Design a protein around this ligand. Structure first.
Ligand code: MG
Ligand code: MG
Lengths: 341, 341
């Protein structure tokens, strides 16, 4: 049984300001969650809130600690589905819902003498993550891409969305100096339907291939996502448009996207498991991403990816661009690779 | 890791012939599955094949024992997702796929020191099953219904499909002597779309309410299922039309049914989990059924039901119609109630 639930503010500074369409941050403010069982076992999770995507504010998450304690204290973690149903009511605090649910499995796995990934199926022993190139001058972008490549990463994520002409130029220049790497382009809702299509065609015409083209249009523009999917050569993904399992069922029914970028910070463990199943029962493919998690937080996604083995691509690099005193994940980080202990 | 797998034929005779639309059985010939782990732990499962529903034949199942052994031995049950993916290739032997996948969870849970229901969420501690009234003269049906009612069952499943007029009379007569009970009507594909509608309207006009109206039309008639749903007052369920997670995605997309009767013998654990997630992500509701499982076989569905807690109704009574010396389920059977140990 759970006897205590602790929420605490943890700040992590980025080695350099991270710039994406309509957003710039140089710090990551998360909420660490610790669940304590009567047996003494302690499970840990981390919420990396997003005002832009989930409408959350870190001050608001911290303010509801007492409410969270009242919601699940006294419940046995072996009845984790009950804890999941209850925490699903925190749909307005997605990142916290995610942290609490993972900390629950973390505690439960310890009690069963195993790990979260195995509890989830233990499908894979290793996964590889890409690394992101934020928005900057074409020169700086090429410089960072070149450095990431030298670091061993074979999948480079490129942010775009604020300047179509320069975005195209940037992607073309990056491709030159990183031959052999796969590319994921993320526009974070910055383009109109037509611009998005133009972007993809321009790049395509230069012989460049994009493995995944992330959320090119606004979140409510489901038809726009479909339009881009049906009128451009690269696989299109929903990110901001895919937060819950209901959003995904709708995206599938509408045949709007080739991919859904799952993020525990958007869906929590409960909806993420539903999305995995929905994708495996349809033509949908998945990738897993992150917000601003530290190593403790990314640990949640690593165990989820390793356990379900449901992703074609993994974008779990937020902890790689953060100055963090010490590693706190329950996994092994070896360059672009992440493995089970 | 699994060091061996054994398949064994096991027969159970019914107290009386069980008559459903286009089928009469006097015995249940199942295949018991035993998995042996290097640790010495042994997991058990039971396959109750269906020629009519799955196209399976008990002799064919026993014939591929060596193939199954070669498929899973050498795999650690903690990597059960790998076992699930491999056994998914046995789509032509669904009942066997189910037995093996459950035996896997049965072995894993023992190793972890818990039960299968908790592994799946531990959502509920108790569930209630209905009891079925097979096709017979109206007189015998009424007699059996009253007996089932006196035994404490409050959800009575009634088989119909071969004689519309008599079927209506049978339900009307059963309702009169079982005031307080809910009814599930199963036509096992015996009616045309229009007869299915007329059956429901007639029962409705007499003031009788049907909780679930199971598979009124032929299995390939998806539009027929939808037609009955949109033109009849009771919730319509797909059984024979819903075998895989892909069948269910299609049923949802087409809004063909209100319910899906999940059977491990049709879907196995893997697809059943996917179906539960699809239902919770949509307007679909679920019930869980059985084929001809003995107590060891029903145990599989009891743990799935208790753990996920995803079902509105439970039709797990096949073991109550069989003659069996020793109870072999890992659950407590108290009248219509089934509880975790
Ligand atoms: Mg994204
Ligand atoms: Mg049925």
């Amino acid at each position: 049984r759970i006897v205590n639930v602790k929420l605490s503010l943890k700040r992590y500074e980025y080695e350099k300001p991270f710039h994406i369409t309509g957003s710039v941050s140089s710090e990551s403010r998360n909420v660490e969650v610790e669940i304590v069982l009567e047996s003494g076992v302690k499970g840990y999770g981390e919420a990396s809130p997003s005002f832009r995507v989930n409408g959350e504010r870190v001050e608001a998450l911290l303010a509801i600690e007492n409410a969270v304690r009242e919601m699940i204290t006294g419940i046995d973690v072996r009845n984790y589905a009950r804890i999941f149903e209850i925490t699903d009511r925190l749909f307005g605090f997605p990142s916290l819902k995610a942290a609490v649910q993972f900390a629950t499995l973390d505690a439960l796995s310890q009690e069963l003498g195993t790990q979260v990934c195995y509890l989830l199926g233990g499908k894979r022993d290793e996964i590889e993550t890409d690394k992101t190139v934020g928005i900057d001058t074409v020169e700086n972008r090429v410089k960072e891409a070149k450095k990431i490549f030298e670091e061993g990463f074979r999948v480079i994520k490129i942010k775009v969305g604020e300047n179509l002409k320069e975005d195209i130029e940037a992607v073309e220049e990056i491709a030159k100096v990183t031959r052999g790497a796969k590319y994921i382009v993320d526009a974070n809702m910055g383009y109109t339907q037509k611009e998005a299509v133009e972007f993809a065609r321009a790049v395509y015409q230069k012989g460049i291939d994009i493995a995944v083209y992330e959320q090119p249009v606004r979140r409510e523009d489901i038809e726009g996502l479909k339009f881009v999917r049906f009128h451009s050569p690269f696989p299109v993904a929903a990110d901001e448009s895919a937060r819950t399992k209901f959003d995904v069922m709708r995206l599938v029914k509408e045949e709007a996207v080739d991919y859904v970028n799952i993020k525990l910070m958007k869906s929590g463990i409960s909806d993420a498991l539903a999305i995995v199943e929905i994708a495996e029962s349809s033509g949908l493919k998945l990738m897993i991403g992150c917000m601003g998690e530290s190593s403790l937080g990314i640990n949640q996604s690593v165990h989820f990816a390793l356990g379900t083995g449901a992703f074609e691509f993994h974008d779990l690099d937020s902890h790689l661009m953060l100055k963090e005193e010490v590693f706190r994940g329950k996994f092994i980080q070896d360059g672009p690779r992440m493995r089970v202990k």
